[PDB]
A paper describes a structure:
DYRK1A is involved in elementary physiological processes such as neuronal differentiation, apoptosis, cell cycle regulation, transcription regulation, splicing, EGFR stabilization and synaptic processes. dyrk1a gene is located within the Down syndrome (DS) critical region on the human chromosome 21. DYRKs belong to the CMGC kinase family and are structurally related to cyclin-dependent kinases (CDKs), mitogen-activated protein kinases (MAPKs), glycogen synthase kinases (GSKs) and cdc2-like kinases (CLKs). Based on the pathological consequences of increased DYRK1A activity, the enzyme has been suggested as a therapeutic drug target for treatment of DS and AD.
To confirm the binding mode of the [b]-annulated indoles, we determined the crystal structure of DYRK1A in complex with the representative inhibitor 11. The binding mode of the inhibitor observed in the crystal structure was in agreement with the one suggested by our docking analyses. Specifically, the flat heterocyclic core element of 11 was located in the adenine pocket and kept in position by a hydrogen bond between its carbonyl oxygen and the ε-amino group of catalytic Lys188. The latter topology suggests a weak halogen bond, although both the Cl···O distance (3.9 Å) as well as the σ-hole angle (141°) were outside or near the limits defining this non-classical interaction (< 3.27 Å and 140°–180°, respectively). Limited direct contacts between the kinase and 11 suggested that the inhibitor likely achieved its potency through excellent shape complementarity. However, compared to the model compound 10, the new congeners are less active by two orders of magnitude and are nonselective versus the closely related CLK1. Regarding this parameter, 11 displayed a fivefold improved solubility compared to 10.
Residue numbers in the entry: 135 to 481
The structure:
C-alpha cells in the first residue's frame, strides 16, 4: 500500500481518466512523463478552459526540487505578464493527495513529435530559422539580470508548439533549472545536449543552454541528433569528431579531463589512448558540419536539392551561427543578444 493506494511503487500518482479533483479539475488523460513525475490533461470547471497539470512524485527530494521550479516559474511569469517571451505559464499550484500539482496553460505537441511527423526528414531551414529566433529571444529573457536562469535541460521534447498549425513555441519543464548563484547539480542536461563544461566537471553558467540550442537546431533540420552519445565517453568523443580536441586552457582547468583525454609532456592534449588497433571514432575535427548540413550538396542527405529558401548562402550563414553556439569556450560562446544580430536572421 503506497500512499493509501493512490501511488504506485515509483512514487507516481495512479492516474484515472474521468476522475474529478476538488470540485474543480476533471482529469481527462495522461499526456507526459519525466523523472519529476507525470503530466495530465484536465478541464478546469471554474475558469472554463483546458489545462495541463504536472503531478510531482510524492517523494521529498522531488517535491523539494519542484518547489524550486515553482519559484522560478512564478518569477518568470511575473516579468513576462503579456506572455511574449516564449516561457510556459504557471497558472497556480496545489497539494492534492500528498502530491504537489502544477497547473499550466494547455499547449500542443513538442518538436521531437514534429520531427517524427516528417519521418525524420527534418523541417525546413525557414521553419528552423523561426524556432531559432524564438529560442534566442527566450534565452535572452532568461539572461535578464533579475532572472539569470539556466534552464539546464533544453531538448526538442521541452520545446512545445502553442498550436499545431502554427510556428509559435514555448519552453517548458524548468524542473532542473537554477539561477546563476545557486547551482546544485554536477550531472545535468540530457546527454545529447550536454555541454563540454558539464561533461568536464567544470563550473557552468547560462551558456550551457546555448550549446544545447546549437545541437537542437541542427537536429531540427537534419532530423537526427548531432552528438548522440550512448554514455559520457561516447558523447565527448562525438563532439571531438566534429569540433576537434578542446583547447588546452579549458582542459587544464577541468576536473574530469582525464576521463576522456591525456596530457602529453609538451603540454598538449590528445584523446586518451585506445587498445589493440581499435578504431571507433573519426579523427578529431574531420566530421565536418559543412557536410552534415549538406552546405554545397543540397542540404542534409541532399534532400533539399533545388528547393527555395535552402541556398548555399543560407546554409553558410546557418552553419556559421551553429559553430558560434558550439564554441568550446563558454566565455566566448555566442550570447542571445548577439545571436539575434546574426546574418542568418536578416529579413
Ligand atoms: O512541463 C512539462 C514537462 C514535461 C513533459 C510534457 C509536458 N507537456 C506539457 C504541456 Cl502540454 C503543458 C505544460 C507543460 C508540459 C510539460
Amino acid at each position: 500500500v503506497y500512499n493509501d493506494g493512490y501511488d504506485d511503487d515509483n512514487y507516481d500518482y495512479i492516474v484515472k481518466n474521468g476522475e474529478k479533483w476538488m470540485d474543480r479539475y476533471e482529469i481527462d488523460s495522461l499526456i507526459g512523463k519525466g523523472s519529476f513525475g507525470q503530466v495530465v490533461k484536465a478541464y478546469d470547471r471554474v475558469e472554463q478552459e483546458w489545462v495541463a497539470i504536472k503531478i510531482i512524485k510524492n517523494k521529498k527530494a522531488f517535491l523539494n526540487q519542484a518547489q524550486i521550479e515553482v519559484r522560478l516559474l512564478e518569477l518568470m511569469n511575473k516579468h513576462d505578464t503579456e506572455m511574449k517571451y516564449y516561457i510556459v505559464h504557471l497558472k497556480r499550484h496545489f497539494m492534492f493527495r500528498n502530491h504537489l500539482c502544477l497547473v499550466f496553460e494547455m499547449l500542443s505537441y513538442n518538436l521531437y513529435d514534429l520531427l517524427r511527423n516528417t519521418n525524420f526528414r527534418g523541417v525546413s531551414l525557414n521553419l528552423t530559422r523561426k524556432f531559432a529566433q524564438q529560442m534566442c529571444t527566450a534565452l535572452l529573457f532568461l539572461a535578464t539580470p533579475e532572472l539569470s536562469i539556466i534552464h539546464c535541460d533544453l531538448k526538442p521534447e521541452n520545446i512545445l508548439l502553442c498550436n499545431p498549425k502554427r510556428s509559435a513555441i514555448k519552453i517548458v519543464d524548468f524542473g532542473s533549472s537554477c539561477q546563476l548563484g545557486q547551482r546544485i547539480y554536477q550531472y545535468i542536461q540530457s546527454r545529447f545536449y550536454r555541454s563540454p563544461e558539464v561533461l568536464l566537471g567544470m563550473p557552468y553558467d547560462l551558456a550551457i543552454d546555448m550549446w544545447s540550442l546549437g545541437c537542437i537546431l541542427v537536429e531540427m533540420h537534419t532530423g537526427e541528433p548531432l552528438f548522440s552519445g550512448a554514455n559520457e565517453v561516447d558523447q565527448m568523443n562525438k563532439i571531438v569528431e566534429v569540433l576537434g580536441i578542446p583547447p588546452a586552457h579549458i582542459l587544464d582547468q577541468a576536473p574530469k579531463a582525464r576521463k576522456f583525454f591525456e596530457k602529453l609532456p609538451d603540454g598538449t592534449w590528445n584523446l586518451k589512448k585506445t587498445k589493440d588497433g581499435k578504431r571507433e571514432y573519426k579523427p578529431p575535427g574531420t566530421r565536418k558540419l559543412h557536410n552534415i548540413l549538406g552546405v554545397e550538396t543540397g542540404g542534409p542527405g541532399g534532400r533539399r536539392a533545388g528547393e527555395s529558401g535552402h541556398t548555399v548562402a543560407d546554409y553558410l550563414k546557418f552553419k556559421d551561427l551553429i559553430l558560434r553556439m558550439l564554441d568550446y569556450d563558454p566565455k566566448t560562446r555566442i550570447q542571445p543578444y548577439y545571436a539575434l544580430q546574426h546574418s542568418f536572421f536578416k529579413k
